[PDB]
From a paper:
Auxiliary subunits are membrane proteins that associate with and regulate AMPAR trafficking, cellular localization, gating kinetics and pharmacology.
We also investigated whether ZK affected the closed-state conformations of the GluA2–γ5 and GluA2–γ5–CNIH2 complexes by solving structures in the apo state. We found that the ZK-bound and apo-state structures were indistinguishable with nearly identical conformations of the individual LBDs and ion channel, suggesting that both structures represent the same closed state. ZK-bound structures are used as references for further analysis as they produced higher quality structures. Expression of endogenous CNIH2 appears to be weaker than expression of the engineered GluA2–γ5 fusion construct, as evidenced by the presence of GluA2–γ5 complexes in all collected cryo-EM datasets.
Residue numbers in the entry:
A (entry chain C), C (entry chain A): 392 to 548, 569 to 775, 784 to 822, 833 to 907, 919 to 1035
B (entry chain D), D (entry chain B): 392 to 549, 569 to 775, 782 to 820
The structure:
């Protein structure tokens, strides 16, 4: 008997060169699925085979100008090339001229998506419902409400120093019952409206955290092309010379009618060439792209070097492979028995598990975890760590009691003139709110910057985007506007009015310390500046967030906004006045009650 | 054969010039609805056509100085055209000189407004989950337990629950976590408890409704008809300044559109638009305070454009139709007339509208926005307005304390 | 000139008889849209008309066996019957043989659904998240935890009588801070685990109420047939001889492909005949049915006697009406001008508003309302009303102090022997849980009853469904089972063990009142029976709700379950023992401390 | 012409007898997939067919005593049939005597389990929103603040915060609303506060997650492959007792299905089903503890039946195919073979499967269930188990109190 000439193709893992090639000869240079399958069929049939490799590169098709065939179907029709144990898809136009055996493998068009890519929660992730503008104004709040209870209970009739009134503050905001209670009509109103502050913020934090966790459950990963059909944020993709595209056009099923419709009319080109590109467009387009393989390919890609892509769903259609006997040869019935005999003993299921899975280098809670609430354990430990430090402080302060007024004047004076400074500096030095925007250039994740600002209150000015050194002023301007100075002008200007009263009557109490009521009314007008700082900065940011929601989203266009060093200086100026507003009023108590 | 001269005019999506309009032939450079329609009419009737975009540039109207038709009607009557497969609107003065054909598309005057996007919060927008009748029935019951806890604790010991205290312990209860002036009576056992159960169910109804308020974002349009747009005065009207739309409101006598005309009669921020595409941007810029009135073919197309910014609301105010015209006496007049119906019966005219308006278009067919300081804004105002009101009454207190 | 013969049809509101007919003559017997339109056209054209009414009944069609026409199109072809001002739809098969004018009215296939039918919230609607099994076991809880604090603080070392411990109970469950606190290691554990009870129930009530209000917003009313296409709980309906059905078959639009698919293969028959039936199938099939009219009909039905149906969506297709001139008559061009002249002046828009709307007898908050939370105002008022009643009680009890032990023995003894009774009665008398089930017969809202039970614990027995008088027993049974006695047997049996100790040592304290510690340990074993009653009834219902969730829904099949008089007797037996468990222990305190 | 005798067998949805099976003709009384398939094969090839439901009633197999084919293969070979448009499965022993045709439907052995319906709660099911690592890190930090509040308040006054109290005030804090043994030190200002902020964020994470736990009901299947069904022992295997499915697991040598065969070898509650429709009810009755193994055509059909109670999970274990058979040498063998492919290329075979399995079927393609006492069940058990533990230690307390 002669040597039957097998004609496979260099496609992995079907036929690929052995690593020790250019050192071997003939049919013991190849390895793969079809090399093991050729060895199986030959034992059953009676062969003594000898593999070659397909001439041009191709599987088989009919050139519509000359009606010649090309490739494996080309070689076996035209006199050359016997039995064709190879990934040759059973179509109608091939089996008119050649004989296919029964399918040794059942493929189909399937969906490739990148691996669901877990998105590990941050340390301070619990403070995601309330934004960081809200968390910093709460710190301004329970400091400030403590100072008012420092005032209004030792103002006149008693147990509400800043030591005790921050305890009211840290007490009531964290919803636990405060031990003591005020006893004056004005003392209750502070405890009255602060207990309304906590009941809204906690009911806004819980309700928005239930808005995060519900929508996160409400989304769903792709598990079918029916699921892909509704979706428009994950774009499809097909090879554009071949049977994957050919399926969607002439299909009449209503889902594939909608799927081709999107692919036909979209931008940019989703009709990829050269499948290695299509695999790449899945990987560097995270959760935005979905390429459509043939099922025996994307099960191979999945069990291969880094396991980045994954098959989801079921076979959209059904097809097969087949050994391709020439047209009427005597190797057409014994091969057709030697496929069905291997597909029952389990050899065709063993050789798939071998090359796809076993020679593949890869692998095979509806509840909050510790990583979600992680910062509150670190605030707890970071809190208790601060507590043991202050346990040293009271032990040393009592030890000095075992074994000054001028310092109290020293604290109040210096904290005042820095509070006079850092507000007046900040309103003068134009380094408040930093607006930033631009549009996107795709495929590069661009850096469009063109526009910016560095605007304060009065001297609003611009830096890039024609670069405009002579920018604008409060004198009438001519499209963006700036509602910062438009509404929140008097709220720092009345703050300066209370604060100018503050340092002068402090100095009146300084130059002649026997004056008592002067330092008293000095302190009263310190906190009324600091309360104007609160309604200043709140109405400040609220005017910005109203300008934020006026965006009319514009998905491509991006934005950015950051606070400047002057916004920090007025935030620091809140601390300097208020913590002097306690020391000025406490200085009255040490002075006048001694008198 | 005869090479029928088909006239059209350049408006989207009826005839749009393809990007190869400098490197292709006449019948292959134009795309659109009328391009797909002229292929279907020629397929059923049977002729050869070459698209002949109008020389003047208008649809058609009489000039009552020289009595000469202009535009596409002008090419039909005088001789330079043979069919007019285009968006000619069937009117009386056009009907006297040419022959239309049994409308292939039914349009009407409609309402164009800006998209209902997410809006600005108020300074009392945290009172949105619980309605206004519940907030007042709490306060009227806050005074209710206040007068009970006084009349209980004054009549029973025969007095740590006067006007001063009984108003307070109810406030200390509903604004949560309690207060240390606990009642002491078996009535006060109840007076404590049954107000305290009223604390639980309101706050659990405030939290749960606000969670549903933030999960399913379900926005609505301000106006949804000409009726609701008639009674309002906030959102401004708008119409073209010389056309069939402005003429429609003038002579109408059903007294609803006459009300809409009496607004636009005075109307002095100049609501009338010149050159419609200006009025498209006028809706986009004027913050949903402006409502332009278009034909319902342009409203369904501009809605399907980038930037997605406008939406049609309501039913068609009137009904007018398009029509494949033919000259006053021709051989095409009857076979086209049965061809326009036969496309409509099979669903071709319903598919070609679906393709160009809805399929070949933008805007397609949950982002978990965190809360802003503008959402909870007035709570800071009530807080500082509480703290400021404390220092006033303390200054009142210090007055009569030192005086007495 | 002659008298042109108009041929309309008795269809409302187009042509219908005037109320004063059989008293008038000719063309002044009719009224409607087409009677006003005939008067309009005649003025423009030049007529002197005379209405008749269509011969057989019909509009016009071609009988496919004999090719004769029938009706209005029948009469105007065959020599009779001039101008045809009537609801004659412009189709292709009519205009081949007759001339239609331009459409005077633009109809379309539209959706009819019943009015959204507001579903007014109940008085006690706030207690819908937690079911009434949970609310009654809470009442068992804060009664019981009060009795344990009645015990464990006057057990040994002080301020926790039932007067004060219900105050702990009513205090802590309603989340407000309790004034006093226990001081003993066992006293804190009661306050410890009860403060864990409230934190789960409140967090289960708030979280489930947010499950109701979100899904209620998440549903959406029908506003398009695209919205109808996804839905499967509202079934469609079409007339079955006519153009409404004819549209869905030969349509190729993907939505109408899916809409016909459902209608073609469903059960029962949704292809209604005789439109008045189809309107009726909308009305007595509340939010389950949707019939598909032609747009000029369901805008008439909507503005008509009781306004029960409503048009939603837009026109699925587009069509028209038309005056139908014969084939080549001289009344074909002046009518074609007299329609377009009326459709510009607004007369065809005036006559629609007249007959549809003006001669129609009909009309033209994303927030909780008071009706939702209504019972808590009634609990508040009903609470304060009870308070003023007890204000009389303390005033009279102090007035008797101004101006008995045997009663305390009398309270404890009688409440014990009724507690011995009503538990022993209930476990004996088989009238516990009432199961009920059956399947549904549609179109009648059936009363299937066949099966039931009246089962207690031991004597489980059956009443209907072969009626089975000899039912079953605890001796082995042979499909439903009964896990009541399977798990919750010892929890009342250990309760009898504590309770048998209870009344005997009570009677030992009765026959010789100088015995002190006997009545003490009498009381200890009263509440341990009542605590076994708690874990009895909880594990009871929890075993039922596990059997409830084993249902595997079966949408047609219904179910019902009610508690019996024996379940109430053991619930009453909880009160009788516990409220004697306070009076027995308080009797020790009055006795031994006096000694 | 020739009146081709087409054989089939009565199984759904291949050939089902229509309700007019006593008042119609042969070719109009049967409906199904093979009925629609035999119309398509006759349309492309060209002949006349009359359906000839098999006399014996089986598919086909050798009887190795008399060597006579039975069933549909028996009618083909011996002469009583001409084509076999039916669900014959292509096997080797059938291939030697007749000629199949290039499968029109690709099936495989699959896994049949009960639907994952809503399940029973546990007696500790209220610990489901917060995971098990969070509940333990609370208790380990509950002891953490306990040892801090002692070491602060013992070292500072140089003692109302011993073992007795410092364990208590942390419990009084996290189990909400506070306790009246308030700390007194600037450390105790912190020790109060930073534990109190830990109260807020956990309970707001418990409430918000439980609200998401009840809103979106998202159930999962226990097993979702043969791999996950291999490693378990809880859910029982199941296969037919004499067929190609049982024979498949026996001779398989890939060692995963060999593990599945070693279970069914011992298997003594008799897992093997006689007459498959019994095993359909065995999955329905045995509470999702039984998993039957079917061909993937029956699993996709019985899933689309009333009562909707079973679902297929996982991929096909093997791959076998159907086939329109033809006798050993015929004139129909080649034109049918190209007709089966030509239907598949056009999408006819994909549509006819879609029609009979998925369209002409039940089970279609949020009910707001209130909580039950079984949901919050163990909280009553911790409560009474707390109250019972109180009376024990009190009895311990009374012992050494009167003794000392
Ligand atoms: Na809460």
């Amino acid at each position: 008997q002669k040597t039957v000439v097998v004609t496979t193709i260099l496609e992995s893992p079907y036929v690929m060169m052995k690593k020790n090639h250019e050192m071997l000869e003939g049919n013991e240079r190849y390895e793969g699925y079809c090399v093991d399958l050729a060895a199986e069929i030959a034992k059953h049939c009676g062969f003594k085979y000898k593999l070659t490799i397909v001439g041009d590169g191709k599987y088989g098709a009919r050139d519509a100008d000359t009606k010649i065939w090309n490739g494996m179907v080309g070689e076996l029709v035209y006199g050359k090339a016997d039995i064709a144990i190879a990934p040759l898809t059973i179509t109608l136009v091939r089996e008119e001229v050649i004989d296919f055996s029964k399918p040794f493998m059942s493929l189909g068009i399937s969906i490739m998506i990148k691996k669901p890519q877990k998105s590990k929660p941050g340390v301070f992730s619990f403070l995601d419902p309330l934004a960081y503008e809200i968390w910093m104004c709460i710190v301004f709040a329970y400091i400030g409400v403590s100072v008012v209870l420092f005032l209004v209970s030792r103002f006149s009739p008693n147990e509400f120093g800043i030591f005790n009134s921050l305890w009211f503050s840290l007490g009531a905001f964290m919803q636990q019952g405060c031990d003591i209670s005020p006893r004056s009509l004005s003392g209750r109103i502070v405890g009255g409206v602060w207990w309304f502050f906590t009941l809204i913020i906690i009911s806004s934090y819980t309700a928005n955290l239930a808005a995060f966790l519900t929508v996160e459950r409400m989304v769903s990963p792709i598990e079918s092309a029916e699921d892909l059909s509704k979706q428009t944020e994950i774009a499809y993709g097909t090879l554009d010379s071949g049977s994957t595209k050919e399926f969607f056009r002439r299909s009449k099923i209503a889902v594939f009618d909608k799927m081709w419709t999107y692919m036909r009319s979209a931008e940019p080109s989703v009709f990829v060439r050269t499948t290695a590109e299509g695999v790449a467009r899945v990987r560097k387009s995270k959760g935005k792209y979905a390429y459509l393989l043939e099922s025996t390919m994307n099960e191979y890609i999945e069990q291969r070097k880094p396991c980045d892509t994954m098959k989801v769903g079921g076979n959209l259609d059904s097809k097969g492979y087949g050994i391709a006997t020439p047209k009427g040869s005597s190797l057409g019935t014994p091969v057709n028995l030697a496929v069905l005999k291997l597909s029952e003993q389990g050899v065709l299921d063993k050789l798939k598990n071998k090359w796809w899975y076993d020679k593949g280098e890869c692998g095979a809670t509806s509840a909050l975890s510790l990583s979600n609430v992680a910062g509150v354990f670190y605030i707890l430990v970071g809190g208790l760590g601060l507590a043991m430090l202050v346990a040293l402080i009271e032990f040393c302060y009592k030890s000095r009691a075992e074994a000054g007024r001028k310092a109290l004047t020293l604290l109040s004076s210096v904290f005042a003139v820095c509070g006079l400074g850092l507000l007046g500096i900040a309103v003068s030095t134009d380094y408040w709110l930093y607006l930033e925007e631009g549009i996107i250039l795709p495929q590069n994740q661009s850096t469009e910057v063109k526009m910016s600002l560095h605007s304060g209150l009065w001297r609003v000015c611009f830096l890039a985007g024609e670069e405009r050194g002579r920018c604008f002023t409060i004198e009438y301007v001519m499209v963006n506007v700036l509602k910062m100075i438009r509404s929140a002008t008097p709220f720092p200007l009345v703050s300066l009015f209370f604060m100018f009263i503050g340092f002068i009557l402090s100095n009146i109490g300084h130059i002649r310390p026997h004056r008592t009521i002067l330092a008293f009314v000095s302190g009263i007008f310190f906190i009324l500046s600091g309360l104007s700082l609160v309604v200043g900065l709140v109405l400040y940011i609220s005017s910005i967030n109203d300008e934020m929601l006026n965006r009319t989203k514009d998905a491509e266009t991006y934005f950015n906004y950051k606070y400047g060093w002057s916004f920090a200086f007025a935030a620091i100026s809140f601390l300097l006045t208020e913590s002097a507003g306690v020391m000025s009023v406490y200085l009255f108590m040490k002075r006048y009650t001694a008198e």
